[PDB]
Amino acid sequence: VEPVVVIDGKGHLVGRLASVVAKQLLNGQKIVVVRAEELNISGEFFRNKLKYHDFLRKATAFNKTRGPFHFRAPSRIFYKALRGMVSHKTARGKAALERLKVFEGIPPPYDKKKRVVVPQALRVLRLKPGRKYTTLGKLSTSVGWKYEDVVAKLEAKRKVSSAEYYAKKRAFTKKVASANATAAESDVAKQLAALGY
Amino acid sequence: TKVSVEGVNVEKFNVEYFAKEEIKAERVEDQKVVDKALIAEIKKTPLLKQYLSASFSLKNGDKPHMLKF
Amino acid sequence: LPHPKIVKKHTKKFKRHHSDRYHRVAENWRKQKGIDSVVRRRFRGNISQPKIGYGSNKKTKFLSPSGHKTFLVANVKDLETLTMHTKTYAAEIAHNISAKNRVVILARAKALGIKVTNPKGRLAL
């Protein structure tokens, strides 16, 4: 298939996404998730914002510091989520979340390299059209993550510097799709077609 | 892909043709009798002389339950 | 011999329960007898106990890897009883027979065609 399947959250459902991202490591599959912050979920916002804090309270008694550590940053939010379906703790586990990697944003060296998605888990394609659905970003923040922006900003950058890229490419092709077009229709070609190609 | 084979004399070789009790000069004489009586028929079809010289392999996306041979 | 393929049934040693934890309790198998014992009640995961089903195929019993039955020979008279069963029995020279005596049991068994299970015993070159 491919050795590294850089995924991409951007419109997925923390769950589901996970699960599969999961299985795939368990079955020896180096993944890498990006744009964590643009991960989604189900339900209103003022929920996930609960189904969480609660989570927050948790924490330990006698010694708060030793206990259920409440990570903020998206990435991790979603991590957990996942290190939660992988018998983590046991060689085969550790041996996984060993195979994982979840960045917010989409820093190098991944910027430069195709990503992809996981049908079987996009908002668009699973949530009964028009239904309440939260979007990490806020949901992180709302509860600590101090950067939403940096990401953001130091984003827009990327997008740029790319699209730009694009172009240059779109320009390129066009030429091909043109050469091939013309130098298309001469024998040789023909033939192929017969077979199909 | 089938060739013409009927031009070939093959009945010389049976099992016993393959005992051993540096290559035998007898064996190489039977090669060239077959081969030259064969090359001719491969030369009829386009690209077959080239097709045979190449190596078969599987390429990424060749799922051999789908594949036709 | 064109012997049957010898099935071993159970190759592990039948150790005694707890013969591993305590140094006093020995690897020599003994049944457990307390009625609160799990071994005696054969709960899952717990050690396999010798039952009669593990019994070997009567055709192949006693047969060693060579496909011969072991047989102890003390002296060169005792060997020459197998004069007729070279295909079936293997002359195990017995452990206490000396050096000077052995070299003589090997002379005959080689001549008779008896496969000795333990040559090179005490003996050098």
Partner: protein, 68 residues
């Protein structure tokens, strides 16, 4: 000619080919940090007053190089 009884080397014979003064030995020791050169090595011999001795002395003098 070298022999093995068990998985260990033990006997070592040195026969001279015509006529034939012929010896036999029992190696005891053997083992394995030098990594020697292809230069030819010097001989030394120690304690051999006996005439039976300087016959074995008289062996090895011959069986190893007189080049060094």
């Amino acid at each position: 000619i070298i022999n093995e009884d068990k998985k260990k080397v033990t006997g070592l014979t040195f026969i001279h080919l015509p006529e034939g003064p012929t010896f036999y030995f029992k190696l005891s020791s053997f083992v394995e940090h030098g990594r020697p050169t292809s230069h030819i090595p010097e001989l030394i011999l120690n304690n051999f007053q006996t005439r039976l001795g300087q016959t074995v002395g008289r062996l090895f003098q011959s069986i190893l190089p007189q080049n060094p």
